[PDB]
Design a protein around this motif. Sequence first.
Motif, mmCIF file in Angstrom:
data_model
loop_
_atom_site.group_PDB
_atom_site.id
_atom_site.type_symbol
_atom_site.label_atom_id
_atom_site.label_comp_id
_atom_site.label_asym_id
_atom_site.label_seq_id
_atom_site.Cartn_x
_atom_site.Cartn_y
_atom_site.Cartn_z
ATOM 1 N N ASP A 37 0.863 -1.181 0.000
ATOM 2 C CA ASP A 37 0.000 0.000 0.000
ATOM 3 C C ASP A 37 0.899 1.230 0.000
ATOM 4 O OD1 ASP A 37 -2.694 -1.063 0.071
ATOM 5 O OD2 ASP A 37 -2.266 -1.683 2.132
ATOM 6 N N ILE A 38 0.660 2.148 -0.931
ATOM 7 C CA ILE A 38 1.543 3.284 -1.168
ATOM 8 C C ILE A 38 0.845 4.563 -0.746
ATOM 9 C CG2 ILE A 38 2.690 4.663 -2.977
ATOM 10 C CD1 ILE A 38 3.985 1.939 -2.511
ATOM 11 N N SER A 39 1.579 5.428 -0.037
ATOM 12 C CA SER A 39 1.177 6.810 0.174
ATOM 13 C C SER A 39 2.185 7.748 -0.445
ATOM 14 C CB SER A 39 1.086 7.143 1.636
ATOM 15 O OG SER A 39 -0.066 6.539 2.177
ATOM 16 N N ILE A 40 1.699 8.822 -1.046
ATOM 17 C CA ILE A 40 2.541 9.880 -1.564
ATOM 18 C C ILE A 40 2.298 11.079 -0.666
ATOM 19 C CG2 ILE A 40 3.026 11.378 -3.544
ATOM 20 C CD1 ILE A 40 2.245 8.998 -5.343
ATOM 21 N N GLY A 41 3.318 11.423 0.098
ATOM 22 C CA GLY A 41 3.117 12.364 1.178
ATOM 23 C C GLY A 41 2.075 11.830 2.113
ATOM 24 N N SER A 42 1.067 12.661 2.351
ATOM 25 C CA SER A 42 -0.073 12.350 3.209
ATOM 26 C C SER A 42 -1.214 11.663 2.464
ATOM 27 C CB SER A 42 -0.651 13.632 3.855
ATOM 28 O OG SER A 42 0.331 14.519 4.366
ATOM 29 N N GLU A 44 -2.881 8.648 0.352
ATOM 30 C CA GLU A 44 -2.924 7.259 -0.118
ATOM 31 C C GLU A 44 -3.057 7.248 -1.632
ATOM 32 O OE1 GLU A 44 -6.012 4.647 1.394
ATOM 33 O OE2 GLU A 44 -5.607 3.161 -0.181
ATOM 34 N N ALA A 45 -2.174 6.515 -2.298
ATOM 35 C CA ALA A 45 -2.170 6.405 -3.757
ATOM 36 C C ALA A 45 -2.799 5.117 -4.266
ATOM 37 C CB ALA A 45 -0.741 6.497 -4.297
ATOM 38 N N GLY A 46 -2.801 4.060 -3.472
ATOM 39 C CA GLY A 46 -3.378 2.796 -3.875
ATOM 40 C C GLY A 46 -2.417 1.657 -3.600
ATOM 41 N N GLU A 169 -4.767 -1.265 -11.508
ATOM 42 C CA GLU A 169 -4.517 -0.364 -10.379
ATOM 43 C C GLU A 169 -3.040 -0.324 -10.025
ATOM 44 O OE1 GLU A 169 -6.633 -0.972 -6.643
ATOM 45 O OE2 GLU A 169 -5.313 0.422 -5.594
ATOM 46 N N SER A 170 -2.389 -1.489 -10.031
ATOM 47 C CA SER A 170 -0.971 -1.525 -9.698
ATOM 48 C C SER A 170 -0.176 -0.595 -10.598
ATOM 49 C CB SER A 170 -0.388 -2.932 -9.806
ATOM 50 O OG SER A 170 -0.958 -3.784 -8.856
#
Lengths: 200, 11
Positions: A37-42, A44-46, A169-170
């Motif tokens: 599970d990825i976050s970019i900064g604050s 959530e990206a997916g 999505e990936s």
Amino acid sequence: SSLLSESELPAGISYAEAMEGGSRPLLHPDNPVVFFDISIGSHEAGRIKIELFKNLAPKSAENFRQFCTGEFRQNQVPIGYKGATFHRIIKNFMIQGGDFVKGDGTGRLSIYGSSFPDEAFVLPHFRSGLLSLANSGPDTNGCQFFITCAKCDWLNRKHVVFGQVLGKESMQVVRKIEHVTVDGGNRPRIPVTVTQCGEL
Amino acid sequence: XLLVTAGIVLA
């Protein structure tokens, strides 16, 4: 040569096939599928789901897999990709991450010791969406990896390709990471973090 | 250039 040409590739690893993948492996039934599970900064990206090609690169697959699940203990402390980052991002080339030791590309540790040798170089870097080992020359694999964002066959026979992302999505998440703003060293200006990871 | 190393990234 163990390196397969693009016309000799096994079933299950074309871009079209991978993008139709779900949470089960496409190349061999016993391949693990893991996720970040990825976050970019604050934000959530997916989720990125990844098939690891144990059938072709078992040591590389198992190292990555244990770092996804937190199974590996160093000095009796679990260590791995949870909270790790993508520290080097080059648009139209690749996204590089997994340095949970130092967070900057200098770190190296594996489940086998400080490093582990290159497995056979079976697959080429033939398309976007492939998982491959970062290293610092022959037989210096550790914890870092990259996901291709383009064809990059000049890396063939120097980096082991050992997995593929699964599902649309990936790839969307990979593309989001690829396009974040970077500094002069290609380090993102806002951290790109694996907030959770594991095995499906 | 465009390599993927760990420690001294080259051109």
